[PDB]
C-alpha cells in the first residue's frame with residue numbers, strides 16, 4: 001500500500017532533519033545487578049560466628 | 050513553516066532563504082523562497098537547500114536533477 | 127583532516143565467499159596463505175564454540191604480522207571483543223603477573239545483556255519527613271502530565287539534600303540505580319528573580335514514570351570488577367568504601383566460579399548471551415618463562431577464548447633461562463600447544479604496490495619515475511624507509527609549489543636523510559663514538 | 561547446567577575403573593595407561609579412605625602424555641562435595657603474598673568441613689494481611705492468615721516480621737517462606753506456586769566449607785570481603801593454632817566433621833628450594849591433604865640452586881614421596897583419542913581422512929591432530945559439506961605449519977630473523 005510508503009516518508013522526514021524519532025538518548029545508567037554474592041555467604045558467616 | 054506564512058506575506062527585511070526540508074517541491078518552494086523576494090529588496094537572494102548523504106533527500110534531489118524535477122511518485126534505493 | 131600511522135589502509139582481509147585470498151583486495155598484496163589462514167581464524171571465531179586454542183604469527187620485520195592483527199580486528203567488528211596487548215606491559219608493579227594475565231583473559235570475554243530502567247522526573251513539591259519520624263522523606267514529582275509522590279530511602283534522600291534541590295526544582299531521578307540529579311528550576315520562576323546564576327528549564331514533558339529497554343554490552347571482567355569492589359555512589363559511605371582501598375587486588379577462584387555460575391543462570395534465563403574474544407599480544411618473546419609456564423595451564427582452561435600471538439626471532443634463548451634456546455624464544459612445551467601461520471617477505475613489485483596504495487590513502491600524488499625510484503631504494507634498505515620518506519618527499523614537492531613528487535624530491539630527501547645502514551657506516555669512521 | 565565448552569580435558573568424565581581397580585581400556589573417555597589408571601584408583605581409595613593423611617605422590621612423564629588429563633579424570637571421579645583444588649606453580653609467585661604463607665593458604669584451602677544445622681521454616685499461601693498499629697504512636701500488631709493444602713491458620717506477627725512485610729511488597733495471594741530464627745521472607749510465585757504439607761516444616765540446612773574461610777573470617781572483621789576479593793595476607797599462626805584446636809574439639813563432639821581435600825600442583829620443576837623445604841616440613845602436619853605432583857620436566861637445575869637435581873626436584877622431596885610415570889601412546893591409542901575428539905566435537909571425518917589424521921598425529925604430536933580435526937570442520941563446511949575428506953586434512957596440514965617444519969624453515973632462514981645477538985638482514989640485495 002502506498003500509505004505505508006507515505007508513513008515511512010513521514011518518519012524519514014522527522015528523523016533525518018533531527019533525531020526526533022522518540023528522541024531517547026540513553027543517560028548511560030549502570031547495571032544494577034542484584035545478585036550480591038556476599039549475601040549468599042553472609043548467612044554462612046553469621047552461622048560461623 | 051511552509052504552510053504558516055510562506056504563502057502570501059510580503060516580508061522584505063532579509064536577503065537569504067534556507068530550506069530545511071521539501072518533500073513535494075515542484076511549486077511550494079518557489080513561493081516560499083520568493084516571499085522574501087519582494088520589490089523592496091536591494092540585494093540578491095541566496096537560497097540554501099539542506100540535503101543529507103545516503104538518505105531520501107539525496108536520492109530525491111538526484112533523481113529530480115535526472116528528470117529535470119517534473120514529479121516524484123516512487124522513491125526507492 | 128585524515129590521520130593515519132602505517133595502518134588504516136586495511137578495510138578487511140579481502141577474501142571471497144569461497145575462502146580464496148584475492149591477490150589485491152583490502153589494500154593487501156601477497157600472503158595468500160596467510161590471508162587464507164586468517165580467514166580460517168575468522169570462521170573459527172564466528173563458530174564461537176572453540177575455546178583454548180593458540181595461533182601465533184611467525185614472521186620477521188615488515189612481514190605484516192601486526193598488520194594482519196589489524197585486519198582481523200577490523201573484520202571482527204565492534205561487537206566482537208578484541209583486546210590488543212603488548213608482551214612487555216604484562217609485567218605489573220602492584221599485582222602479580224598471572225593476575226594480570228587472568229584479568230586480560232577475562233577482559234577478552236564479552237557478553238551482551240538486556241535490561242530496563244525506571245526513570246522519574248518532575249518538580250518536587252514537598253521535602254518533609256513522614257509522620258514520631260525517621261530519616262525518610264516524601265517527595266512529590268510534578269511533570270507536564272505526571273503527578274506522583276514518592277517516599278525514599280535515607281541514603282537516596284541524603285544524596286538529594288546534598289544536591290541542594292528545593293521546591294520549584296525539576297530533577298532527574300532513577301529508581302533502580304537511585305542516582306540523583308537536578309535539571310534546574312522551572313521557567314515559571316524565571317520572572318521571580320531578574321538575575322540569577324541558576325538557569326531555568328521547562329517542566330519535564332510526559333508522565334513522571336518512564337520505561338525503556340537497554341541492550342548495553344558488558345564484558346565478564348567488568349561484572350567481576352563491579353561485584354569485586356564498589357564503583358560509584360552519592361552517599362558518604364560510598365566514598366568511605368572507595369577510599370578504604372584504591373589498590374587493585376587479585377580475583378579469587380571462587381569469585382570466578384560464582385560469576386560464571388550467575389552468567390550461566392542469566393543466559394539460561396534467555397536474555398543474556400555470550401560472545402568469545404580475541405587476544406593479540408605483541409612480541410610474546412619479550413615476556414619471561416614464568417608467563418609461559420603459567421599459560422601452559424591457562425591455555426587448558428574452559429572459558430579461555432582464542433588468543434593470537436606474534437614473534438620476531440628464531441633460534442634464541444628463552445627469557446629467564448640459560449641453556450634453554452628455542453625457536454622464537456618460546457619453550458617447546460607451549461609450542462606443542464601452539465599453531466603457526468607462516469609469513470613471507472615482499473619483493474620489488476609488491477613493495478611498489480603497497481607504497482603507491484598508502485600514498486593514495488596519504489592523499490599524495492607520485493609521478494611514475496618517482497614511483498620507480500621509491501621502488502628501487504625501498505628494497506636495498508627497507509620498505510619501511512621509503513614508507514617514512516613518503517611524507518617528506520610530498521612536503522618537499524609542496525615547498526617547491528608543485529603537486530607532484532619528482533625524482534629530484536626523493537633525491538634531496540635521501541641526501542638529507544640517512545638510513546640505519548648509513549648511520550652504522552658513518553659510525554664505523556668515529557673519532558669519539560661519532 | 562554447568563557452562564562447559566570443548567576443551568583439551570572436557571571429553572573425560574571420570575577415570576573409569578573397576579571394583580578391583582581394573583581400568584577398562586576405553587572407559588569414560590579415559591584410554592590407555594593401565595598402570596597409571598590403577599594408581600589413580602589407588603589414590604582414589606586414599607582420598608575416600610580419609611583415615612590417612614600427609615601422603616605425597618609424584619606423577620611424571622613426557623610432555624603431552626595426559627598426566628594433566630589423568631589429574632582431571634581423577635577430579636571427575638571424586639565428583640561433587642569433595643574439596644578439590646587445582647593450581648599451577650606460577651600463581652604462588654606474588655609480591656603482596658610471600659611464597660611461604662601462600663603455600664600455607666594453599667594447604668589450608670584443601671580440607672573442608674561439613675556443618676549440619678537444623679532450621680525452622682514456615683511456608684504457606686497467605687489469605688490476607690491485616691496489621692494493627694497506631695497512626696502516630698506505632699504499636700504495630702500485624703496479623704495475616706496463612707493457608708496451605710491442609711491448614712487455614714491465622715498468625716499474629718511480631719514487629720520484625722511486619723516491618724519486613726512493609727519492606728518487601730506482598731499481596732494476599734502471594735506465597736512466602738518464613739524462617740523463625742532469621743525472620744527473612746522469600747516469595748517466588750503467585751496464584752505459579754502450589755504449596756503443600758505442614759507449615760511448621762522442620763528441615764535441616766547443611767553447609768560445607770574449607771577451614772580457609774573460617775580462618776579468614778576469624779582473622780579480621782574485614783575478612784569477609786578479604787576472602788571475597790583475595791586481598792588477605794600473613795595470618796598469624798596463633799589463629800591457625802586456635803582454629804585447629806577448635807575444629808579438633810568439634811570433631812570429638814561431632815557437631816562438625818572434616819573432609820580431607822585433594823591438592824593438585826602443576827609445574828613443580830619451577831618451584832623454589834624454600835618452597836620445597838616448606839612442603840617437606842608441612843607434610844608432617846596431621847591436616848595435610850593428599851597432594852600429587854605434576855612435573856613435566858626431567859633432569860634440570862632446581863631454582864635457587866646451581867645443582868641439576870633429577871626430575872627438577874631435590875631428592876629430599878622425593879624421599880618422602882612415591883613416584884609413578886606415564887608412557888607414550890601406540891597408534892591405536894591415537895586412533896581412539898581422535899575418535900573421542902570426533903564424537904565429542906561432532907566431526908564426521910572420512911575413514912581414509914581419519915587414518916591420515918592418525919598418521920599425522922602419530923609422527924608429529926597428539927595436539928597437532930587435535931587442532932587439525934577442529935580446523936577441518938570449517939575447511940570442509942566452507943565448500944558446504946558436512947563430512948570432512950582427505951583433501952581437507954591435507955589443506956589443514958599445509959596451511960598450518962608444524963613445529964619441526966618451522967624449525968627447519970628458520971634453520972635455512974636464520975638471517976631472515978634476529979639471532980641471539982639480535983642482528984637481522986632486511987635488504988633483499990647484497
Ligand SMILES: Nc1ncnc2c1ncn2[C@@H]1O[C@H](COP(=O)(O)OP(=O)(O)O)[C@@H](O)[C@H]1O
Nearest residue numbers: 132153154155186187188189190191192193480
Ligand atoms: N599485504 C599487505 N598489504 C599492504 N601492506 C602491508 C601488507 N603486509 C604488510 N604490510 C605493511 O608492512 C608493515 C609491517 O607490518 P606490521 O605487522 O605492522 O610489522 P611487522 O610485519 O614487522 O610485524 C605494515 O605497516 C603494513 O602496512
Ligand SMILES: Nc1ncnc2c1ncn2[C@@H]1O[C@H](COP(=O)(O)OP(=O)(O)O)[C@@H](O)[C@H]1O
Nearest residue numbers: 568569590591592622623624625626627628629
Ligand atoms: N588416555 C587419555 N585419554 C584422553 N585424553 C588424553 C589421554 N592421554 C592424553 N590425552 C590428551 O592429551 C593432552 C595432554 O595434555 P597435558 O596432560 O596438559 O600434557 P602433559 O601430559 O605433558 O601434562 C590432554 O589435553 C588430553 O586431552
Ligand code: BEF
Nearest residue numbers: 056057058059084
Ligand atoms: F501577495 Be503575493 F502573491 F506575494
Ligand SMILES: [Mg+2]
Nearest residue numbers: 190191192193
Ligand atoms: Mg607487525
Ligand SMILES: [Mg+2]
Nearest residue numbers: 623624628856
Ligand atoms: Mg601437559
